[PDB]
């Protein structure tokens, strides 16, 4: 029905959403999902609005796994709203931290080529049908080639968090963003 005063204050501290926005999200989340529990099939349907269902399936599964921080197979409102807050309203530093953990498939603290390519392939499959791409990065192999060499500092075939944040900052989309710095 409505968020309790204790949960509302905990979510206030853990998100960048206002009290009005938090209450507005909770009713809509409960409307769109009566049980308060998002499974993979429902999550795939959300993503199916923006890109074709079959194409988006593999990447949608990987995102769902990162959303699910307690790894129990479902997403509650807290796990949804915190994950949505970081991705849409979080700082660039902490956005990349949330991203790093998604690429880290086994959960050791390192991104191998077997993991990095797998996520890149999943992005390319979803994107292919409506987005045209460049040319020197127009292959999942061409992409993972550019990434690892620009990031793997000590060349152990693995990517640490510190390598990830620094290496991603040279991305064209972030290059545009950094010119909008207030100071
Ligand atoms: Ca969960
Ligand atoms: Ca790993
Ligand atoms: Ca390394």
Residue numbers in the entry: 6 to 188
Paste lines from the article.
HPCA or hippocalcin, is a member of the neuronal calcium sensor (NCS) protein family and is highly expressed in hippocampal pyramidal CA1 neurons, in particular in their dendrites. In response to increased intracellular calcium, hippocalcin undergoes a conformational change and translocates from the cytosol to cellular membranes through a Ca2+/myristoyl switch mechanism.
Mutations at positions T71N and A190T were shown to be critical in development of DYT2 dystonia. Mutation site in hippocalcin T71N is located on the interface between N-lobe and C-lobe close to the area of interaction with peptides in NCS-1 (26), change from Thr to Asn strengthens inter-lobe interface by creating additional hydrogen bond between ND2 Asn71 and OG Ser106. Affinities for calcium for hippocalcin(T71N) (Kd = 93 ± 12 nM) was not significantly different from the wild-type, even though the mutation was located within the second EF-hand of hippocalcin. However, the mutations significantly decreased the oligomer formation when compared to the wild-type protein. Disease-causing mutants of hippocalcin showed a marked oligomerisation defect suggesting that EF-2 and the C-terminus domain are important for dimerization. For the dystonia-causing mutants hippocalcin(T71N) and hippocalcin(A190T), calcium influx upon stimulation significantly increased to 51% and 62%, respectively, compared to hippocalcin wild-type.
